[PDB]
Amino acid sequence: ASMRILLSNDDGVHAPGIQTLAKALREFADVQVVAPDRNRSGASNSLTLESSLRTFTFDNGDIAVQMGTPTDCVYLGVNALMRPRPDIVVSGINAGPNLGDDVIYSGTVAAAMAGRHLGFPALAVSLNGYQHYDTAAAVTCALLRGLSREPLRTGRILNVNVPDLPLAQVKGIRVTRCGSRHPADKVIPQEDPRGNTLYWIGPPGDKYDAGPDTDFAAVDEGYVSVTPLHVDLTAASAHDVVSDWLDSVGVGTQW
Amino acid sequence: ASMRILLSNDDGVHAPGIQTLAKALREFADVQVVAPDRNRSGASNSLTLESSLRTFTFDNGDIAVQMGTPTDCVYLGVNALMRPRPDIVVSGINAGPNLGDDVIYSGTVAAAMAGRHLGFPALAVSLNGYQHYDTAAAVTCALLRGLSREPLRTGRILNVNVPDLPLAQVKGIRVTRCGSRHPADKVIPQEDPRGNTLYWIGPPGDKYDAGPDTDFAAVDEGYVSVTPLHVDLTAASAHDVVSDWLDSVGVGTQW
Ligand SMILES: [Mg+2]
Ligand SMILES: [Mg+2]
């Protein structure tokens, strides 16, 4: 009845965040890195369909996936590489926040989503900076101890963001909703040596919805934010409006 | 007041689905492919952050993005490559459905999501097969004519799935919610010439929620499915449960 954890991330088997978390979890659970071989912060919920995947296994046992996305890593971990199957997926600790409408772009979150059907809700854990990995590890371990203490009935993935603060300064925990940003609009051009313009994706838009119940607000104020996530992208509140619109413009109806 | 459309997809500037749609839209709108240079059905909402992006432009004007994901293509299209800015993003026609809980993995949908802040709701259009691109083009054009006829008040992206049927056999339109599947669990091993096991991601799980109001049910029955989507992954119905759970297990509270 020791927890079997598939530990993945967005930064690969080596990032200090995953290495720090690995050390911490091994104190009380059996841990298998199934993680990328190398930075996939771009990756979102991408996965490899047109190619087979190769691993490689470091001397310390860190199962790793060549050119693997975080979702690839977790899918292979759960369905092939782990035996017996993991009880839970943990993804992190990510160096940097995964907050607001950024979460759909997050590989850290994606790895957790890929573990959503396991016995325990998956955890994605992101540190709001690069200093206090131990704070994020302590928060993760508390959550894991909670799950063993008592099952979480509703909510299949928890998106956890930890303030980059010494643990003593973390004020508590807040259950939050995702905030949002204004549209990101910047493109940074840079010419190559031959004078061709290449384009970088610019920084995220300014915060739009960062009210007190948001993940943004909780982290800014020094709380751990926990947002339950799901994968259903249906905008349920739009249903009647879209239906009425179609009727009004006569699309899909003769009359 | 002719519509300016940024047309992208998951399959690149050339896939017959985008080429067929391009031909159809140009009859009444100004169209710029900003699309990948080549198949990115793996891509989901991935985007390129650690590298700059290079384009290339075919003789027919098809702006294309080297190693570009669908989100890269739309972001660059909207913010840099299109002038004046597009009025709307259209992504498709995809060869194959984007239904249920697959939509978070879909590059076609991702390209549309990336156009969600424009004046008109973005459209992702997927054909449930590879035959009747003209059917999907006709449905797309009807929707676009609807949007010009009257603005859609709520709902920022519409995920459209078209039955792979001659238009005359399409029964109508249904506003739907996303269905879901059982966990996908298959991994297909295949050895390389040196005897190393490589792993393919297997097929999706069996359908779980495919009730009549679902996108799955509508398409199966020969209707166009239109699901309004958003990017907020918050599982709002889990809030109280997670809060109560934390209190119960004493995580985040001293008492
Ligand atoms: Mg990262
Ligand atoms: Mg595709």
- CA dist B33 and B39 (Å) reads 16
Q: Across the interface, do A177 and B236 touch by the CB < 8 Å criterion? A: yes
**Domains with residue ranges and CATH for chain A:** 1-255 (3.40.1210.10)
B246 is written with which tokens? 């934390």
Residue type, A71: T
Strands (E), chain A: 4-8, 30-33, 35-36, 55-56, 64-65, 88-95, 122-127, 157-162, 172-175, 180-181, 187-191, 197-201, 207-209, 223-229
The residue count of chain A comes to 255
Phi, psi of B176 (to 5 degrees): -125, 170
Ligand having the closest approach to the CA of B8:
2
Tally of CB atoms within 10 A around B193: 5
**What is the signed CA dihedral for A240, A245, A248, A251, rounded to 10 degrees?**
-110
Ligand having the closest approach to the CA of B10:
2
A4 is written with which tokens? 């079997």
Per the listing, tokens 């059917």 go with B135
Residues 6+ apart with CB under 8 A from B248: A150
B66 is written with which tokens? 């080297």
Q: Across the interface, do B79 and A113 touch by the CB < 8 Å criterion? A: no
Nearest to A107 by CA among A119, A89, A92: A92
- CA dist B248 and A21 (Å) reads 25
A183 is written with which tokens? 């549209």
- CA dist B50 and A198 (Å) reads 13
- Helix%, strand%, coil% for chain A, nearest 5: 30, 25, 45
The residue count of chain B comes to 255
- CA dist B251 and B255 (Å) reads 9
DSSP A78: I
Which technique was used to obtain these atomic coordinates? X-ray
- CA dist A123 and A91 (Å) reads 6
Reduced to 3 states (helix: H, G, I; strand: E, B; else coil), residue A243 is helix
Task: For residue B229, give the nearest of A79, A229, A235 by CB distance.
Answer: A235
Nearest to B163 by CA among B198, B137, B195, B132: B132
B46 is written with which tokens? 């991935």
Q: Which chain A residue has its CA at the smallest distance from B228's CA?
A: A235
**Residue spans of alpha helices (H) in A150-252:** 215-220, 239-249
Longest CA span, chain B: 70
Q: How far is A89 from chain B (nearest CA, A)?
A: 14
Q: How far is B213 from chain A (nearest CA, A)?
A: 11
Q: Across the interface, do A47 and B47 touch by the CB < 8 Å criterion? A: no
Segment holding B201, helix H or strand E = strand B197-201
What order of strands is seen across the sheet that includes strand B4-8? Answer: B30-33, B4-8, B88-95, B122-127, B157-162, B223-229, B172-175
Q: How far is CA B56 from CA A194, B62, B91, B206, in A?
A: 15, 8, 19, 40
**Burial readout A189-212 (b: 16 or more C-beta within 10 A, e: otherwise):** eeeeeeeeeebbbeebbebebbee
Task: For residue A229, give the nearest of B69, B234, B249 by CB distance.
Answer: B234
- CA dist B69 and B107 (Å) reads 8
Entry resolution (Å): 1.5
Per the listing, tokens 């839970």 go with A88
Phi, psi of B146 (to 5 degrees): -55, -45
8 A C-beta contact, residue B91 and residue B10:
yes
- CA dist B24 and B27 (Å) reads 6
A35 sits in the region (left: phi over 0; alpha: psi -120 to 50; else beta) called: beta
Per the listing, tokens 């650690």 go with B50
- CA dist A23 and A142 (Å) reads 15
